[PDB]
Design a binder for this molecule. Sequence first.
Ligand SMILES: O=C(Nc1ccccc1)Nc1ccccc1
Ligand SMILES: O=C(Nc1ccccc1)Nc1ccccc1
Ligand SMILES: O=C(Nc1ccccc1)Nc1ccccc1
Ligand SMILES: O=C(Nc1ccccc1)Nc1ccccc1
Ligand code: NA
Ligand code: NA
Length: 154
Amino acid sequence: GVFTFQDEYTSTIAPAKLYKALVTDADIIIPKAVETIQSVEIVEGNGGPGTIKKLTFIEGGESKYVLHKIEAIDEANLGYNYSIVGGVGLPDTIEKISFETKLVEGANGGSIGKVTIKIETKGDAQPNEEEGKAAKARGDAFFKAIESYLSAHP
Ligand SMILES: O=C(Nc1ccccc1)Nc1ccccc1
Ligand SMILES: O=C(Nc1ccccc1)Nc1ccccc1
Ligand SMILES: O=C(Nc1ccccc1)Nc1ccccc1
Ligand SMILES: O=C(Nc1ccccc1)Nc1ccccc1
Ligand code: NA
Ligand code: NA
């Protein structure tokens, strides 16, 4: 069975610019903007659906990574769907996790990043409350880091 979550992230950057930083130019901007992320490798595909990116980052002294597979990409509508097909975002505890994301206009010309998360867990375990909280904080940090970078580097 499926566990579904909906979260919202806010940025002062305009949706079309954010989208371009986090999708179109992600493999350049993410590592430059986010001090905790060291690299983005494209391992498969051509930036469309099917594309797999490897993001490597630091957390707790540890170098970790995640594999991001692009599920759908609707640039016209500022949409981008992905799943974690490996690394540390797909632990032994999680069978499948995907994200459906949309960037929409927020307050004062900024953005709201709308994220729908679907999770399937291994065994009868529900998604880990603690790790969900940690993941939201990491998400916030990330979007904020992107925002600081793009505020200074338009
Ligand atoms: O790549 C990421 N996001 C994104 C957002 C909008 C459009 C396309 C992609 N996010 C990401 C967030 C945290 C860790 C790793 C990746
Ligand atoms: O924080 C996130 N923001 C975001 C960015 C672009 C488009 C939509 C949302 N996503 C996120 C979700 C889960 C884990 C990590 C990052
Ligand atoms: O575990 C979660 N996210 C994650 C994303 C990328 C890498 C590592 C972890 N999210 C989560 C979302 C809702 C409830 C609980 C957890
Ligand atoms: O880990 C962080 N971002 C990230 C990058 C790729 C995949 C998942 C998350 N940020 C971070 C935030 C606070 C403390 C440590 C790291
Ligand atoms: Na970096
Ligand atoms: Na389960």
